[model samples]
Target: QWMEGPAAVHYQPASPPRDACVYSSCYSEENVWKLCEYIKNHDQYPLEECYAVFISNERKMIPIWKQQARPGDGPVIWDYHVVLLHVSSGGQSFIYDLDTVLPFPCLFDTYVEDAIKSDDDIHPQFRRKFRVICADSYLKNFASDRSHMKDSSGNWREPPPPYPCIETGDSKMNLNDFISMDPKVGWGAVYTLSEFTHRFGS
Candidate 1:
């Protein structure tokens, strides 16, 4: 089953605003809503934003969390789509779905902690003020004692199915392909991380 949500979260083309501005900032939310509205009316959403909303819509009842660490500040918009899949093949893989529409210049606090923690061995240069939204789908039920092969104990087991293949490259964002219900209409705000130069903290 598949689902859809807000439009693609666009990247901030310029530098991110400060924390003070975040509480009062209208940039990120404005842009995010703009894109969401664009997709709602036009039937086409941005690839990045669509991907997150799709997975969120699909796994309507799953627990999810977004991690953007800031040394000083905490997390901003909890804007990630993560899941654990149980493949039929008995193997596990981690899927990181990226959001292309997210703007760059994210808060230095967030990136610096990430750099220190080194979640995915990411490079600092690669983290240069860019919105890199990613979805992490992993195999949670791996490493079980139940072997895939039938042993001398007369117990037979079926191997898990293969992992699903996700199409690479930037696909066109299409809401009609996934959305079933009319989106709730209203104005709202989406929070985001910003930078403060050498001193990094969320």
Candidate 2:
């Protein structure tokens, strides 16, 4: 049965690590690549059927409000966040996000709608704009430097590749300004939801 296959191996639900270092900023992209690799290497899901979904803001200030912040209170903002969408051969899609408090690999449409409706402070416009890229294409085009990422021993580990995508920017400038000046520093292409599903959806 489908539930007994390799595709189901990583279906167990999981939440993000408790450490402050494992927050959305540090682990979002890494988690995307990690899941994609796991799918590809295991041959459980076709590489063509997998996609990486990036949710970002053009204004470059997506906010993550504190747990106890009142309705009117301002948020602790970040520039962006990333998640993955995998389309099964049966034409169903699931969302994979470490930052989400919702169920893991939840229904794609349900995830999208819930996010937009759950928080009034989270700009609906920002949630509407998303980029979907083929997982294989992303793996080939994008490279990350895990050198700054922590290892199993909880130490900062060096990247294996000679030139990983190093995170650098001017403290004086905003994220949008810095990225516009150096677009290559970021991950995969920017595509609308329709474009993404059309190209990679089952």
Q: Among these predicted structures, which one has the highest TM-score?
A: 2
Query: Candidate 2's residue-wise lDDT over 1-202, tens digit each?
Result: 3542213334532223323123334446656766676667765568887777665556655544321222333443545666778776655677776556555667666665554333334455543345566888666554444543568787765334332342434222122321221235444456544554445433
lDDT string for model 1 (41-137, tens) is 4433223222112221222221112333222333232222221111112121111212211113332233234322332343322222212221111
- Scored against the true structure, residue 163 in model 1 reaches a CA lDDT of 26
| Per-structure clash totals for the candidates | 20, 0
Quantify how close model 2 is to the true structure by its C-alpha RMSD in Å.
9.5
- Model 1 misplacement above 4 A: 1-31, 35-54, 57-59, 67-202
TM-score, candidate 2, is: 0.56
After best superposition, candidate 1 residue 177: deviation in angstroms?
A: 7.4
The TM-score obtained by model 1 is 0.18
Cα error of candidate 1 at position 190, Å: 23
TM per prediction? 0.18, 0.56
Least lDDT summed over 10 consecutive residues: which range in candidate 1?
A: 134-143
Predicted structure 2: lDDT: 0.53
